[PDB]
Each structure stands twice: as structure tokens, then as C-alpha cells.
Amino acid sequence: MWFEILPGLAIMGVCLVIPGVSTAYIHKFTNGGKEKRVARVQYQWYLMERDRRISGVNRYYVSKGLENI
Amino acid sequence: AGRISAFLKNAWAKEPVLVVSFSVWGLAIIMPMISPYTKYASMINKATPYNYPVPVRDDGNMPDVPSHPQDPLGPSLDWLKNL
Amino acid sequence: TDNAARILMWTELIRGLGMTLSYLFREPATINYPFEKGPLSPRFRGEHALRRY
Amino acid sequence: FFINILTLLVPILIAMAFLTLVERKILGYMQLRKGPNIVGPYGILQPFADAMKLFMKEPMRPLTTSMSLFIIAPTLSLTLALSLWVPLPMPHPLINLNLGILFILATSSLSVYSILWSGWASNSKYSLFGALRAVAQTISYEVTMAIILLSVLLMNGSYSLQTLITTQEHMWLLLPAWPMAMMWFISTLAETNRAPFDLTEGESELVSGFNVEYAAGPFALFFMAEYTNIILMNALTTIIFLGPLYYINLPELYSTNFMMEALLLSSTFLWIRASYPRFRYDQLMHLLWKNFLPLTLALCMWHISLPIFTAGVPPYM
Amino acid sequence: NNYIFVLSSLFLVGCLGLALKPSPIYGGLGLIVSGFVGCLMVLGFGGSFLGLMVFLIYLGGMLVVFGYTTAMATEEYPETWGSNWLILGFLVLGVIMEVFLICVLNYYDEVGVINLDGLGDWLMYEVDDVGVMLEGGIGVAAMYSCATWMMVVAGWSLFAGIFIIIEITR
Amino acid sequence: NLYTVIFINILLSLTLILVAFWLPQMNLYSEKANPYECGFDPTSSARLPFSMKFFLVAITFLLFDLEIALLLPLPWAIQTIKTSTMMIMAFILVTILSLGLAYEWTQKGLEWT
Amino acid sequence: MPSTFFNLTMAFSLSLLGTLMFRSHLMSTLLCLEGMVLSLFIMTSVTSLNSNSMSSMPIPITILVFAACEAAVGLALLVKVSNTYGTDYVQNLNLLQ
Amino acid sequence: RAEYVVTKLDDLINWARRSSLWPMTFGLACCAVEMMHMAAPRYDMDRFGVVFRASPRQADVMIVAGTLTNKMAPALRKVYDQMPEPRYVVSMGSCANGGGYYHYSYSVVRGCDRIVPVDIYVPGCPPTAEALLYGILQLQRKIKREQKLKIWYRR
């Protein structure tokens, strides 16, 4: 019947919903609970470079809020 | 005046893609001339901050150029914040 | 406008899509031959054989 | 990062192998067959066995061929087909290009370069016919397809791919741009060579086209690249035109909605394959330069005028 | 780190093979290897539009240039880079001339052209760090607004090109 | 990053060509390596000159590709301040392209010779 | 930068040596001409990128459009040569002496 | 134990060839209709995973259907020789088995055994589509029960 194709289509749906969820979770584990900043312009890249130089452990993702100041 | 209408309806029945393409072409030609929002696009592209507009020197001369950024003087954006 | 909506939306190709959409929701006509064998006849002539009294 | 490379590149291979399985099952249920039921639980172990048959069969080394282009075209074909997935958005991409739409366009033409090098260096008259109808097919599709991508990215002002989902957060682009959407679906059928617009693989006028002399191995790796392009441009149409609701708190809900929508689009692709008869290389070029190019030039005209008429000038990011 | 010099030596190799002139079916392969090399060079330099734009315009031109090689200007027994031995000897002669040129070019000049640990440091001259428009896309967007005569003369070139090509091929 | 993804795609497809070639058994002879054309040997050489039939529509495919690479900076040219001459220039060159394709459509060279 | 620019100048001198000789075909000479198109684009874009003179970005798309349009004119010129002859070669064209 | 590993790798390499074997869009006969009837959805090829490709380089098994005349003989051997090295041949029907009719004709090669090896002879003038779907089951179990890596090991 119509429910015969749906096992193979369901494991197709599982194995193609796994890379986007996996790359979002590995971006979260890469950047420590935060997401990876995107440098569309040069100002965002200088912003991320200044974020790395403010954090000082060669790390973009950890950041100094008002706990340092 | 029936020949142009018969040719238009015959091309509409047979090959309507060039009729739809020339109608959408003439609509795109004439619709900035009709619409009043043509003049708002240059207002949008002027009133976007895109670089730093630098401060100017003053000798107490001009009153239109403000000192506080929250002054009512200068080109405001009540036509963009509310509209 | 009916002819100019038959063209430029290709609604008779949408009609053929609906025909194949009607045929995809059917329990199919195949049989699973090593476990579900074929329809035949009593007059179906096959392997030659010598009978006996 | 390499963990993300392996866990994005392995399950896209499992996904296109299951796309070939649901091709055979969906064309079967369209054609009143049942599809490959006898191997696996319901078909699941058929395309793994298809790869494990076609890679443990040997290829030819023909005299008439050129061996360097014979071995360098299909390694390109799998590399470009698996490398168009790396600017694709998902929630957050594996690689965020600054301008990725041009990468998709150019490297999608480079897949036809892999097909075209196969057609010449395969060195048959059938393969040369397939190479020149690849040339005529791209003559039909390419100008039209880039005018479509240009005229929709007059609504999303950059060529970036994350900007498409932050444009399509509130509504799909099917509803403002369905004359773009129908001709883009037709033009990406012409891109990826599916059964209305499948020439150059042929199978019903000529024998195989680009893989006449290409035996198992490189024909399998072309087959890998071709169905990777099928699921690829299905997902690209799904993200660009019927792009789902995007929640920053829940990206996995949007990814599940995107994958239900992409399996609907791939079922529509194979449904179009088992619904329409096949074009010609003359009529393909004829209507993609006659019934498409004035219409997509007028749609380019109207979407040029659309930041002037309704004053929606798109932002940069 | 030596990305642009390695890519530019590969461009020298690909244009050397095109210059050594095979069957033009193979010459299209060598020139599109040089086109991928040049697209990756501009994308490694900072033109995010210009390399992919030349890859789009060059893949689309060179497709039907390749089709015209395999239709019109073809030959029963063609010459690749490894077919004719004068072409192969010229290929290895150009390769040893290129590496002898860089082996004499790091030694004669005493300037910063080639250094073994000091090349690649003078590649990016100045991009603005806090600026927002530094890619090449907005400057070639400005030919619609500032340099309007460029688009007038390019559209007239393509209009006259359509009419000139109909008159040639008639 | 992207160079490493392109090179691991090179390594994956080269590994697939190496497992496609070196692992299966293979004996090869002249009739096996004979080129396929319908079950007979070919009448002439397979690189004999094609007489091309889509030549003028092929050149206007090339020139239309030059026009769409001219038209590629226009999503950032929509952000410009001189929007009146920007829309007039885009209008006049899409009118130039539509008139050139209309000339080719009236001269009927879309059909092959 | 001067190594990259001098190697692009060497690539133009090599493609000058390529288009200034003829081996068997006019089409490989036209491929050398399109190599000059690609080399002048790469040279112009490298010059504009390192000088940061982004107002002259209309110039290399004009390079590509005019030089590839004359390349397309020469490609259909070879189509008309092979139509009026049946052959293609360089030694075929000695009938104007 | 290594022989168990060799025989399980032999079963794993023969399982792929017994399941996803790819035949040939052949013709030539009355028997061309019954290949199309095994394609037809009553007794089905594609339920087994048996796909009519057109190219001899991509084919895996050749279903010779019906008469094989004297003009068709190099047009059959050229195609079989350009099949790649796992090559199995079914002979549909009595004219490809031994020349069912036209055994004593001037222009029929008397069976397909005179030209190529045929791994399974399927008889009838119709082999019914279920009868050579049984034939593809019997070739399927034949190259299941073949031993390639085992006699690679003991050699």
C-alpha cells in the first residue's frame, strides 16, 4: 500500500535530518554554547579578531563581559 | 479598431508567453512612474548609515548642525521609524 | 484565458501529475513469485511428459 | 571540523543511496510495481549492494579512449557533486561562503564539464552525440537559471546562503515568486538531467550518452554524482523557495520541517520523472530560449522595478 | 601561506601547456585548470565576486568553445601534451626553465621577490579593518551609478555582437 | 577550510577510483577494449568532424552569458544612491537583450540548419 | 606581490609565444587568445586588489565582455571557415597569395 | 579461523551480485515482449532489483531473447565481449537455447551456446515472465553458490 515506501523514506528522513542537526551541535560544541560568528564584511572579522585578543587565550568564543571591567 | 484586439486575443490564445512578457515589461517600465514610493528608495539609500559621517568644525556659525545626537535638529527619520 | 492558463502554468501537466498521483496511492499489481505464484489455466501447456495408464 | 566533514559526507551518501532506493520504489508505485522488496527489510540493503556490485565489478581500459581524462573526469564529478553541499545552509552551514550562489552556479556547470569530458574522451560517436547535447542542454538552461537566481536575489540583496533563510523567515518565496518557481524547477530539471529534460544520459534515443564506454566503477561514481545532484538541487529548491519557518531557539524543528519538505520535493522530482514524456535537444533549446527567456527577462525587469515600485530595497546582511 | 605563489606557478604551468599548444580539446582542459587556479587566486586575494564571476563567465564561454573544438577543429589522431615528443621535451624544458628562473631569481636581484622564509608577507597591502565595504562586489556594482558609460558601451558591444554574429553566420 | 574540504573530496573520489580499479579482477583484450557502437565496429573514426548545427545560437549563448555576468553586480547595485540612473541603465540593457533575442527570434536561426 | 606579478608577466610572455606561432590549428591559437583574456583579468584584478582602487572595478568586466565577445566572433569565424572549406588547418589558408 | 572469514567475505561479495544484478534492454524476437513482460508489474524484475540498463558496459547479465541469426552473431558477440568481467547470460526461449524453430534454417545460429557461454537455459517459446523470473532466481542462487574468494584462498 501507500505505507510501504515510508520505511525507506523514513530512514532517508532520519539520515538526512542528522547532518544539519549534527553540524549545529558541533558548532555549539566548537564555540562553547555559543554559535559561530559569520564575517560577511571586514568589520565582523575585525570584531572577532578583537574578541580573540580580548579573551587572550587565542579563543574567539570565550569573552570578557563586565566581570573583567 | 477591432484588428488590434483580434490580434491580441489570437496571440493570447496561441502564444501568450510573449504577451505576458511584454505586458510585465511595460508594467515594469511604467510602474515606477506611477508609484509614489520611487522617491523613498533614494531616501532609504541616503538615510542609511553606511560609513561614518564625520563631525565638522564650528565657530558658533551654523545652528542646523547639532551638538547632541538626540537633538531635534538635523534630518530626522520619522518617515522611516514610524513609516 | 482558459487557453492562456492551459499554457504558462502547464495545468495539463499538473493534470498528468495528478494522474500519476492517483496511481501512486494504489496497492500494486505485483505478486512475490517465490512465495506468491502466478495465475494460470488448466490448459496451460508446459513441460512435455509421458503419462501412464 | 573533520568530524563534521565525515558526519556530513557519510550520511549524504546514505541519503542519495536511499534516494535511488526511493526512486525505484516511487517509480514502482507510480508504475504499479512494488519496487525492490526482496533485498533488505523493505529495500534498504539494495543500493549498498548496488555500490558493492558496481565497485567490485571492474572498469574498462579502452584503446580508443584517452586514459588521463578517462580517470580524471569522474573523480571531478564526485568531488563537485559532493562539494556543492558545503555552502548549503541547513540551520548553520558547514562552510559559510560570502557569496555562495555563484559557487553553486559555476560548480554546477563544472559537473557538466565532467559529463562533457566523459563524452569526448569516452571516444564513441554515441558519446560525442551525448557531449554535444550536453553542450546544447547547457545552452538551453544556463542563462535562464542564472537570470532566475539573479532575479530572486534582487529580493535578498546578497549572494549569501544564510541571508536566504533570514529573508525567508517570515514567508516562503513561492508566494511572491511562483513564475520564478515553476521555471526554476523546470530549469533545475534541465540542470540535473531528469526524465522530462533528460537527454545526455539518453537511454531511449541513444544508448548511454556520457557513460557509453564507462563501465562499472566510474559509471557508478557518475551515478553517485548524478543522484547527489538530484538530492542537492531538490534541497536547494527547498531552501530557496519553500524555505520553512526558522526558530533561533529550535533549529532542529526547522531541520525536520526542511527534511519533510525536501522529501516532498524529491518525491515531486521523481513524480515529474514518472509523469512526463521526454524532451528533444531541439525543442528543449527552443522553448528554453523562446517560452522562458522573454518571460524570465520580463521577470528580471519586474524584480528590478520591485525595489522602486514598492520600495523594498534589500539589506546587505 | 605561500598560496598565491604556488597557485601562480600552477598558472604558469597551465598557461605554458596552453602556450605549447595541444589539440584544442585538451587546450580547453588546460585553460580551465588555469581558470580554476585564477578563480582560487582571486578568492584567496580578496575578490569574492571576481573569481567566481570569471569562473561563471569562463566556464560558460569555454563550454561552447570546447564544443566547437570537438565539432569543427578536430583531428583523427590528435596531439595531447604527451603525444608528440617535441611537445613533451618542450614541456619538461619549460618546467626546468621555470625552476631555473626562480633559482636565478632568488639570487640575482637581492630584493623581495623570492625568499624562502620571506615570501607571502607582502601580499595583502592594505584592507580597512573597521571598514564595512572592502570586497570587490560594490565597486563593480558602482558601474550602474557612477561609471554608466561602461554599461552603455558593454550593452552596445553585446547588441552589436548579436547583430554581427547573425551577419557572420548567415 | 574550503581547500581542505576540496582536497578530502579529491582523496575520497581518488580512493573510490582506486578501490574501483585495483580490487576487482580484470582480464582485458582487444574486443573487450573495442569501442561500443550498437554491436559493430564504428564505420569511421569517432573523432571525425561533426558539422555543427547550433552554431549561431551557441555564440548567442556565449554572449548572453557575458550579459548575465554584466548583470551579476546588480543585487549590490540596487543599494546605490543614484537609483534613477541605475534603474534606467538596467532598463535599457534588459531592453537591449530582449531586442537582440527578438531579432534572433524573427530571423529564425533558433532552428538548426 | 612582485613574484606573482612577474610570473603573470611570464605567463603573458609564454602565451605571446603561443599565439605568435601556429602548430596545426587556428583554434589552439584562439585558445591562446582566451588565455590572454584570462591572464589580463587576473592581472587587472590583482592590480585593483593590491592598489585597493575599487572605483576601477568596472574595467575588468569590460575586459571580459569585450575580449570574450571578440573571442566568440572568432569562434564563429572558424565555424564559417570550416563551413566554406570542410577543413580547418593553418596551411589551408594560402589561397590569398 | 581464516576460512570462515574468507567464505563470509565470499558471501558478502556474492550477495551484492545476486541481488542488484543489472540486465540488458535487449530485443530481437517474439521473446522481446516477454522481457518487457518481466518488466511488467505482474511478475516483476524490479521487485528483485533487476534493472534494464541499455549499455553493455553497465550491464551485468545478458538476456538473449529468441532468434540469433547469422547477421546477428557478431552483433551479439561484440556486445557480450564489451560486457565487463562478471558476465552472466540467460537465454530466453527455445530459439536462443538450441534454435526452437529454424534449427534447420540457413540463417539461424543454432542456439546461443555456439557463440557465448550461457549460464542458464530457460526453455519455452514463452518462458513466462514468472518462468525466467525463476530463471533469474536460479542464476541468483548459482552465483550465490559460486566460490570465488574461497578458491582464491585455497590455490
Ligand code: SF4
Ligand atoms: S523461442 Fe519461440 S517465442 Fe521465442 S522467438 Fe523463437 S519462436 Fe518466437
